[PDB]
Write an enzyme that holds these catalytic residues in place. Structure first.
Site, short mmCIF file in Angstrom:
data_model
loop_
_atom_site.label_atom_id
_atom_site.label_comp_id
_atom_site.label_asym_id
_atom_site.label_seq_id
_atom_site.Cartn_x
_atom_site.Cartn_y
_atom_site.Cartn_z
N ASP A 11 100.88 -29.78 -17.91
CA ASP A 11 100.40 -31.26 -17.96
C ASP A 11 99.03 -31.18 -18.33
O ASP A 11 98.22 -31.02 -17.43
CB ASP A 11 100.68 -31.75 -16.63
CG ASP A 11 100.70 -33.33 -16.43
OD1 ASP A 11 100.15 -33.65 -17.47
OD2 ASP A 11 100.69 -33.99 -15.41
N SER A 24 92.62 -43.31 -31.41
CA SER A 24 93.34 -43.34 -32.47
C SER A 24 92.76 -44.28 -33.51
O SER A 24 92.31 -45.27 -32.99
CB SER A 24 94.81 -43.44 -32.35
OG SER A 24 95.57 -43.85 -33.39
#
EC number: 3.4.23.22
Length: 330
Positions: free
Chosen positions: A35, A199
């Site tokens: 994770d 992004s």
């Protein structure tokens, strides 16, 4: 040193991936969910409330000649779906794909919530976010990666998740045969404890690319792609009959639909998620309503580049002094 381990979807939907991890002497192998959005290594164990264990493999520290109780230490954590676990802590030897850390904090569960119990395929979690998110008290502990870092040939790990197929986690090296073209690196913020990056935009299907900054985290322990409501609406608007369902808890679409791809930007580079990666099947057995793999992050407080996005890429988690993230097509 280096390590390399295969990671395998737990089910036909890629709900999560499990990687075998050796703990203790002699080794006890448990299948853990790696994770990159949390920082605790915790396992089902001989200390777990018996009624809360159902098919999982447990760690039994009393059978490990190298286990030591980390006296007084406790932990407690909750996850994105509201599940949680808690317990006490041992140190022991932990190996992943041939890479060994001695004195690793192994958080032994006393209690787990119902959805952990009910999932026999996951024996615990191995956190790979920054150690500042580790929940052990009163002495915070380091992640496996952090502990391993000074031994590694390069202070990196890489995630190469498969679509309905096994993939790989590597530590300490970049496998140049695992991707195509070049790796594009982008800056990381560690201020919230995550592999947080920005992004450069998105496209839906064969649509024009929209240049827009989208802050989010690279999260191998989240199944889906969670983006701003504007972005997600633009995506699902291209799917006839798709709608957001309060009763179901997100966007659903007709199972008869072929989905458009989704492109996200990394600097000047582009990663394309094929439409099939966004299909998470019927909402219930036999249903003709299917669950979408791109959902709104509204209400989470953060955008999450979960497995749906990451499995479309070869991803480099660079833990140098100045951390960065790299993405390549594959």
């Amino acid at each position: 040193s280096t390590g390399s381990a295969t990671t395998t979807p737990i089910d036909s939907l890629d709900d999560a991936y499990i990687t075998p991890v050796q703990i203790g002497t002699p080794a006890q192998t448990l299948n853990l969910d790696f994770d990159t959005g949390s920082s605790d290594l915790w396992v089902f164990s001989s200390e777990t409330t018996a009624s809360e264990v159902d098919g999982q493999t447990i760690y039994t520290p009393s059978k490990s000649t190298t286990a030591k109780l980390l006296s007084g230490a406790t932990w407690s954590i909750s996850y994105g779906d509201g599940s949680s676990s808690s317990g006490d802590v041992y140190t022991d030897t932990v190996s992943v794909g041939g890479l060994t850390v001695t004195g690793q904090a192994v958080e032994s569960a006393k209690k787990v919530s119902s959805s952990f119990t009910e999932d026999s395929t996951i024996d615990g979690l191995l956190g790979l976010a920054f150690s500042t998110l580790n929940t052990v008290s009163p002495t915070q502990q380091k992640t496996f990666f952090d502990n391993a870092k000074a031994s590694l040939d390069s202070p990196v790990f890489t995630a190469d998740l498969g679509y309905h197929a096994p993939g790989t986690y590597n530590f300490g090296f970049i496998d140049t045969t695992a991707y195509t073209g070049s790796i594009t690196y982008t800056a990381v913020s560690t201020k919230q404890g995550f592999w947080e990056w920005t992004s450069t935009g998105y496209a839906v299907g064969s649509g024009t690319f929209k240049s827009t900054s989208i802050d989010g985290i690279a999260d191998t322990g989240t199944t889906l792609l969670y983006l701003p409501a504007t972005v997600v609406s633009a995506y699902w608007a291209q799917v006839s009959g798709a709608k957001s369902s309060s009763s179901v808890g997100g966007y659903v679409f007709p199972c008869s639909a072929t989905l458009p791809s989704f492109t996200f930007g990394v600097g000047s580079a582009r990663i394309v998620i094929p439409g099939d990666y966004i299909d998470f099947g019927p909402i219930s057995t036999g249903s003709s309503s299917c669950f979408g793999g791109i959902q709104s992050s509204a209400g989470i407080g953060i955008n999450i580049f979960g497995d749906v996005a990451l499995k479309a890429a070869f991803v480099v988690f660079n833990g140098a002094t100045t951390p960065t993230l790299g993405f390549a097509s594959k």
